[PDB]
Design a protein around this ligand. Structure first.
Ligand code: A3P
Length: 246
């Protein structure tokens, strides 16, 4: 098996639902940040090294391609950070893979981002996210990798991540650049709520019969997950409250 679909959409654009939709279509695994968190935390340092490699005056592109290939072995698709930030590299490695750009209203996106992936540095809720994630074994190394992958997607070394106005403009620019770089016939822009129809047409498959398009990972559910991790201190003890997520 090899990469068939490259998900270029940013975090909080429906990437977990797209991951699930691609797993339904292909009956093979799709990579996502949740693969790292819930199945393979040893991947954190590997991603960090690949991102660090991009910051060298002379980066080793073959080291990056080889590292991506090893990370994605056994997967049919990629979505979410950190992989989305490498969509150009993945297009080169997998010239026959199609590209998906999941997208949504930028104000809704920013709101969701601040609730889940990138709270402002002095937002009290950041401390709660961190306390809940500690239950999962997630610590500062994960947050560094996540933030560095977002900065790499936005092509900025120094950026004030606490400035909403900057993030909104980075979002629009990132999505504009995907549409500029990817040949139209190789790209599907999938707006939140678009469902199976356009996706299945683009991938040359029928709409899965009787299977609805996935709809999980809302910020409401993430807030509940953080709170229940804090309260019970065990993922196993609470996972029955969160079907269809991990
Ligand atoms: N089928 C669907 N229809 C509408 N929104 C969806 C959806 N699947 C996921 N989403 C939204 O996509 C966001 C999650 O994205 P990701 O999986 O990339 O982190 C959440 O936004 P909200 O946080 O605004 O609820 C979630 O509600």
């Amino acid at each position: 098996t090899t990469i068939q679909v490259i998900g270029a959409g940013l975090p909080r654009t429906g990437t977990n639902s797209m991951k699930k939709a691609l797993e339904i279509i292909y009956s093979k695994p799709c990579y996502h940040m949740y693969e790292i968190i819930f199945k393979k935390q040893s991947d954190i340092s590997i991603w960090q090294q690949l991102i660090d490699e991009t910051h060298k005056t002379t980066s080793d592109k073959r080291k990056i391609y080889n590292g991506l290939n090893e990370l994605l072995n056994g997967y049919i698709a990629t979505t979410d950070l950190p992989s989305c930030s490498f969509y150009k590299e993945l297009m080169t490695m997998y010239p026959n893979a199609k590209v998906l750009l999941t997208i949504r209203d930028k104000y809704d996106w920013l709101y969701s981002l601040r609730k889940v992936v990138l709270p402002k540095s002095t937002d009290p809720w950041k401390l709660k996210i961190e306390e809940g994630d500690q239950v999962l074994g997630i610590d500062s190394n994960f947050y560094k990798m996540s933030e560095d992958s977002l900065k790499f997607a936005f092509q900025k070394n120094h950026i004030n991540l606490d400035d909403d106005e900057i993030l909104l403009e980075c979002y629009d620019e990132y999505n504009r650049l995907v549409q500029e770089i990817v040949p139209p016939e190789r790209l599907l822009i999938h707006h939140l709520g678009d469902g199976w129809e356009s996706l299945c047409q683009f991938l040359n498959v029928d709409i899965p019969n009787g299977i609805s398009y996935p709809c999980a990972n809302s910020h409401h559910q993430m807030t509940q997950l953080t709170e229940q991790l804090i309260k019970h201190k065990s993922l196993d003890d609470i996972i029955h409250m969160f079907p269809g997520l991990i």
